[PDB]
Write a protein that binds this DNA or RNA. Structure first.
Lengths: 473, 418
RNA sequence: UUUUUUUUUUUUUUUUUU
DNA sequence: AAAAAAAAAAAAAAAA
């Protein structure tokens, strides 16, 4: 019989200085932190596809009700929660004809098909940005489903459907968000099925993407993402101590260049003078030769840590007192030695390795519910387990579906207090602006770093990418 | 009838909180009067407020803050409310609300110091919960109105019913404790007696080829059947190590390092586990990285060991519970076990389509909850048992590794309830 | 790609040993 | 060409 500690649930700050562990409840009662007067949404897609977007925006104007409100809070309407005008009136529409899609879509080569489809949308979006008077905060790309079916790797166009550049990714979404980076245009790619799904029909008659029970949560996740992409701050962390920078390093392969080249990208959060949080990516992608190195050479590690420390000093005035570098990979001494010259004497540099690989599964004795979320097993002063995914009473159910697995948090380098390290990762898991859920199973630095890397390893000609998450998620 | 909730407050300064509170109370079906949103334009405001407090005010809510203590209008409305409190004979008429942390309880206006206040300083949601509970207890009339929006809002505010409670709880893991190890890890230098082009994996007891030494916990002449050249081996050529020192990590030298000596123990333990599963006659499904062992149909009675079924029937697809294990020595000496489901169309032949197996596994696991996995896991492990407390791994003719069939139990100080 | 989660089918690198 | 301990890429399903 071994000890199993519990960490207090992290709270996130809302309007009026009010705090709440949940995000849906926090917005439903107090609203967002900042006020956006309105969202001018530009829509690019078919005439048929604009109807579904108009219908769904009109839908989310009214309150939305799900079957079981205790697990998922009901959606009270966009203006009710965000105090922001998001009307179907004033949507700048760009015409993407079905014939134009069919000209490119019906191609045997996946790569050229993806490139042509993405070019079709991006050219119109750029022309609208440059050559029109209307101002668009966020550009919703309503995309069909056959394109989704046949514009991603390992998709085989049927031979009966065949009618008729490789330096880019074969995936539509990644390449799309990659090529728009030099223009800094916030976008939101929507499938037509993810929108008003009920008209999508299968053989048996039931809807394929049945969201009837989960209408409220779908509206919650769409509204929060749209509000974030328009420049709104839905919530903010309250438990973060002053003088701490975090950083999250994730290594992504690059196929276009010979050898995977192991691009490394980082997501950074620290605090600002005051109380505001500064959650921006810190990506200068530092490419790493060798097939499976996943480890940074001293020059590139020096560049990464320097750029991270300057992005802190130029925003606060002084150096961080303690950096807590999170990573999915285990550091060897080569990067740490290179890091230590860059860090001055005052700074305390800490490296943390987080993993899902460890097969530990805590089943409780009786009752068809899983372990409480927040439980942690501290193996020793340097390593620990944390059940970030599990049962939490407020949402009335487990965040997982089957029995989950904890996060193997190991302080690979530096000293750090293990309890304090586990006190921050649990707080990290609450800043997911791409989704309005109770909490995420992985710390947001390693997640948004993963996204910002999956976007920047799709384009060959990207130079000095933007550091805002608006352009990435 | 008096069915209004007057909210006196600082109207230029305390405007935002008062607006939010009034809106929330209206959304709950509570009729509310307040100057900022209910006072009519172009009217004698004092006469209207007089009428509201004297005649229609069911309950009086005084928003107390640093500004609200000593400015004239708030005091005037409070005095009128006190007169109405005397007239109605209702000691609970005035319910002051404190939203200012800086507002010390010593310097509050005496007329409301005597009264009890509802705490809004730390959170505006616990205060709302307290107000609602007091109003339900004190029986303030509410017109139900929406009856769905209002009820679900009441659920959303009362968020409070579900929190962590302090209570010790027992949890069962999937870590099968390794109870004992053989005394010595032996490196027999068979050298030329061991064929260089031979498969050490085919040896009965588990043995790893390291340099020219054979890594095994077994006896020197225990491999004579597969190696006839080793019959003339000399036992003085062994470099046996005190296994406990390897587990501690104390032993380290040029011959073997600590990292590379414990890595050889894990492979030995895994191979012994595999050989035991071969001994137990359980069929195996080859996975991508590990291998998992699933139990046939008809091998055990009713396909249900103890009181837990391990193989069931689903459409034309028989589902089988299977486990895969791996030894790890970093945290503890343990044998981690992971659960899996594999499907057979006839009960003897596995389905060759990986996609079909994945889909069927998802279909069967959509509804397998905590005790729907734990009970099967403990049933399978108990079925692998040789005695009442553990089962042994055949690693030597005289050396055995006893792994318990009772997983390491965990204990948390906090819990919850249905 | 509204999501999140749990799986699985791949494939790799490093360490040392031959 | 083995092993164990550490790695990312990708499709599939179910519920959030």
């Amino acid at each position: 019989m071994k000890e199993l500690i519990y960490i207090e649930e992290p709270k996130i700050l809302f309007a009026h200085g009010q705090k709440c562990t949940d995000a849906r409840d926090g917005l439903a009662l107090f609203g967002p932190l900042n006020n956006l007067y309105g969202i001018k949404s530009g829509v690019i897609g078919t005439k048929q596809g604009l109807k579904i977007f108009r219908d769904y925006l009109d839908h989310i104007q009214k309150p939305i009700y799900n079957s079981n409100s205790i697990t998922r809070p009901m959606f009270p309407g966009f203006e009710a929660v965000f105090d922001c005008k998001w009307e179907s009136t004033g949507i700048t529409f760009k015409e993407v004809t079905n014939e134009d899609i069919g000209k490119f879509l019906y191609n045997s080569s996946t790569h050229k098909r993806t490139y042509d489809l993405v070019s079709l949308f991006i050219d119109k979006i750029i022309s609208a940005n440059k050559n029109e008077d209307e101002n668009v905060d966020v550009w919703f790309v309503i995309v069909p489903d056959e394109i989704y079916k046949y514009c991603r790797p390992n998709s085989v166009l049927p031979k009966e459907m065949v009618q008729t550049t490789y330096n880019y990714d074969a995936q539509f979404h990644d390449q799309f968000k990659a090529r728009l980076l030099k223009h800094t245009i916030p976008t939101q790619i929507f499938r037509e099925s993810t929108l008003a799904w009920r008209d999508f029909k299968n053989a048996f008659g039931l809807p394929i993407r049945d969201f009837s029970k989960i209408e409220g949560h779908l509206a919650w996740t769409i509204s929060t993402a749209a509000f974030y992409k328009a420049g709104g701050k839905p919530w903010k962390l309250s438990d973060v101590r002053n003088g701490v920078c975090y950083l999250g390093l994730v290594y992504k392969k690059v196929e276009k260049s010979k050898n995977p080249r192991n691009a490394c990208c980082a997501a950074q959060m620290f605090l600002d003078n005051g109380d505001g949080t500064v959650f921006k990516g810190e990506v200068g992608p530092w490419y790493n030769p060798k097939n499976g190195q996943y480890h940074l050479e001293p020059k590139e590690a020096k560049a990464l840590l320097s750029q991270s420390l300057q992005s802190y000093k130029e925003q606060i005035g002084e150096y961080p007192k303690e950096v807590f570098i999170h990573a999915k990979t285990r550091f060897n001494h080569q990067e740490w030695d290179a890091f230590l010259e860059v860090t001055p004497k005052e700074t305390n540099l800490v490296g943390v390795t987080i993993s899902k690989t460890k097969p530990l599964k805590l089943y409780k004795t009786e009752g068809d519910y899983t372990i409480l979320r927040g439980n942690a097993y501290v193996v020793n002063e340097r390593s620990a387990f944390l059940w970030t995914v599990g049962y939490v009473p407020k949402i009335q159910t487990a965040l997982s579906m089957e029995v989950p697995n904890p996060l193997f948090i190991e302080i690979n380098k530096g000293e750090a207090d293990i309890k304090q390290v586990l006190k921050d990762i649990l707080s990290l898991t609450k800043l997911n602006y791409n989704a309005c859920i109770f909490a995420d199973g992985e710390p947001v630095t390693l997640r948004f770093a993963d996204k910002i890397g999956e976007i920047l390893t799709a384009s060959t000609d990207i130079k000095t990418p933007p550091l805002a998450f608006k352009y990435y998620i | 009838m008096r069915n209004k909730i007057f909210i006196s407050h600082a109207t230029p300064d305390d405007n935002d909180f008062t607006r939010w509170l009034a809106l929330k109370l209206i959304g709950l079906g509570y009729e509310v009067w307040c100057d900022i949103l209910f006072l009519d334009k172009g009217v004698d405001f004092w006469s209207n407020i007089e009428k509201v407090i004297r005649e229609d005010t069911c309950k009086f809510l005084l928003v107390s803050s640093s500004y609200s203590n000593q400015r004239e209008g708030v005091l005037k409305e409070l005095a009128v409310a006190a007169k109405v409190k005397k007239q109605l004979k209702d000691d609970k008429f005035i319910i002051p609300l404190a939203i200012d942390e800086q507002l010390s309880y010593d310097d509050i206006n005496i007329d409301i110091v005597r009264l009890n206040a509802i705490d809004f300083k730390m959170s505006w949601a616990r205060g709302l919960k307290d107000i609602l509970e007091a109003f339900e207890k004190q029986k303030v009339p509410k017109e139900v109105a929406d009856a769905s929006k209002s009820n679900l809002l009441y659920q959303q505010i009362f968020l409070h019913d579900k929190s962590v409670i302090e209570k010790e709880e027992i949890y069962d893991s999937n870590w099968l404790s390794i109870l004992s190890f053989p005394e010595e890890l032996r490196f027999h230098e068979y050298n030329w007696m061991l064929p260089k082009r031979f498969d050490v994996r085919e040896l009965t007891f588990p043995a790893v080829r390291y340099k020219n030494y054979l890594c095994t916990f077994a006896w020197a002449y225990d491999f004579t059947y597969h190696l006839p050249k080793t019959e003339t081996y000399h036992k003085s050529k062994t470099i046996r190590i005190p296994t406990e020192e390897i587990l501690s990590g104390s032993y380290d030298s040029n011959f073997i390092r600590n990292a590379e000596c414990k890595r050889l123990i894990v492979q030995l333990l895994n191979k012994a586990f595999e050989l035991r599963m071969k001994d137990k006659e359980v069929q195996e499904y080859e996975m991508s990285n590990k291998t998992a062992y699933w139990l046939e149909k008809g091998k055990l009675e009713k396909d249900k060991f103890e009181k837990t079924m391990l193989v069931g029937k689903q459409k034309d697809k028989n589902w089988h519970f299977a486990i895969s294990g791996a030894s790890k020595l970093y945290p503890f000496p343990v044998l981690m076990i992971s659960s899996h489901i594999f499907f057979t169309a006839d009960g003897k032949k596995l389905i060759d389509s990986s996609s079909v197996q994945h889909s069927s596994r998802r279909r069967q696991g959509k509804n397998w909850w905590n005790n729907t996995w734990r009970t099967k896991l403990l049933a399978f492990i108990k079925y692998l048992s040789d005695d009442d407390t553990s089962f042994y791994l055949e690693m030597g003719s005289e050396e055995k590794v006893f792994v318990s069939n009772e997983p390491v139990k965990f204990k948390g100080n906090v819990s919850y309830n249905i």
